[PDB]
Amino acid sequence: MTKDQNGTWEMESNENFEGYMKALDIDFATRKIAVRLTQTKIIVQDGDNFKTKTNSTFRNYDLDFTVGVEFDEHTKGLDGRNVKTLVTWEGNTLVCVQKGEKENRGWKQWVEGDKLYLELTCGDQVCRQVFKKK
């Protein structure tokens, strides 16, 4: 009944992977490399903060912020542009608004049972994800 379901999620599968990086047109590559090399989605939670992370063999620098801080643009490693990225707790889940200019990066989570969904978008695409908690 509170934002602390602390665990792990191997992410049973991925619908779209490169196309999300594709959507923001990072480099129409990495789809052949980043494919999957341990990709373990994780969640941490601290109280006033929240930093889900991926323990991938390629990268470990994912959800890294505090709630309501309002991540007023300024990103890089992925896109490298400028988009309002507001974060909020739903009471149960992490709702964030990618207030874009061109795209709708609108990335959000929502515990859809015994796993944790990550239903984002990014202008045109719509990355759908499925998990299975631990």
Side-chain angles (χ1 to χ4, degrees):
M1 240 242 287
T2 343
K3 47 242 135 60
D4 316 273
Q5 300 255 23
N6 340 72
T8 36
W9 351 52
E10 297 218 311
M11 193 188 265
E12 84 104 334
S13 269
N14 5 255
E15 185 195 67
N16 192 31
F17 184 45
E18 148 66 4
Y20 151 60
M21 249 194 286
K22 207 233 298 208
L24 71 86
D25 189 347
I26 181 173
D27 219 333
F28 304 160
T30 215
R31 86 267 157 79
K32 316 245 280 106
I33 290 107
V35 174
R36 171 114 93 83
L37 29 158
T38 311
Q39 184 161 96
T40 299
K41 169 269 216 293
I42 297 128
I43 194 154
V44 148
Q45 263 137 29
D46 164 272
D48 302 72
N49 317 349
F50 175 32
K51 327 118 198 197
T52 253
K53 111 215 69 235
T54 209
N55 243 130
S56 264
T57 305
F58 51 122
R59 249 99 222 233
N60 350 251
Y61 186 18
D62 213 311
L63 225 97
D64 257 32
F65 46 54
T66 264
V67 94
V69 131
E70 184 172 36
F71 211 64
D72 296 279
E73 322 187 297
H74 209 40
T75 126
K76 44 223 202 251
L78 199 91
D79 160 56
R81 189 84 45 202
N82 30 80
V83 178
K84 227 64 65 113
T85 290
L86 185 106
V87 178
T88 286
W89 275 116
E90 207 238 279
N92 308 271
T93 207
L94 205 81
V95 172
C96 343
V97 201
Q98 304 314 72
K99 215 205 133 149
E101 158 169 83
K102 154 270 236 150
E103 45 72 39
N104 306 90
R105 268 281 281 106
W107 125 88
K108 24 193 71 260
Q109 297 111 84
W110 41 54
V111 178
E112 267 294 350
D114 295 328
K115 52 257 148 81
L116 230 174
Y117 294 171
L118 311 208
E119 265 144 87
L120 83 132
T121 180
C122 38
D124 338 297
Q125 257 89 108
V126 52
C127 182
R128 190 180 83 160
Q129 303 228 262
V130 282
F131 299 77
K132 51 120 153 205
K133 192 184 74 169
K134 190 150 268 230

